[PDB]
Design a binder for this molecule. Structure first.
Ligand SMILES: C#CCCC1(CCC(=O)Nc2cccn3c(C)nnc23)NN1
Length: 127
């Protein structure tokens, strides 16, 4: 069994910003979801080998996880908040696409997504 390379967290060619909206996505959004009791399945790339999900990367072609998002935020990978919000939505979408409706992992994604939507609802004004 084989995992793909993880998503990019470092690219010196990619233009970067440090903004109050991106600061909010780290200090409020990422940290709120990261500390949650249901965070653990989403804190690193899906290990399709260890989790015995040999079809995972057959079905999921845009993998994303909060480990990757955390690295991207800490290493100022993003230009704008929209890129980071897209990474969260990709992570949730992948979970719903791959998994059987009603499975524990789907309920865990739903709990994290509820808090995500509450925090993004009050994304601060650009300085
Ligand atoms: C018996 C048995 C297998 C249990 C199972 C397989 C799918 C699975 O494990 N999915 C995931 C496990 C960890 C993290 N995941 C993310 C993120 N998305 N999906 C999963 N849940 N029905």
């Amino acid at each position: 069994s084989m995992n793909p390379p993880p998503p990019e967290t470092s690219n010196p060619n990619k233009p970067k910003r440090q903004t109050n909206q991106l600061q909010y996505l780290l200090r409020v959004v990422l940290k709120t979801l990261w500390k949650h009791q249901f965070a653990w399945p989403f804190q690193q790339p899906v290990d399709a080998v260890k989790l015995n999900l040999p079809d995972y990367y057959k079905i999921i072609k845009t993998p994303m996880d909060m480990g990757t998002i955390k690295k991207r935020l800490e290493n100022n990978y993003y230009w704008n908040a929209q890129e980071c919000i897209q990474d969260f939505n990709t992570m949730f979408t992948n979970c719903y696409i791959y998994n059987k409706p009603g499975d524990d992992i789907v309920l865990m994604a739903e709990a994290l997504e509820k808090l995500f939507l509450q925090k993004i609802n009050e994304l601060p004004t650009e300085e």
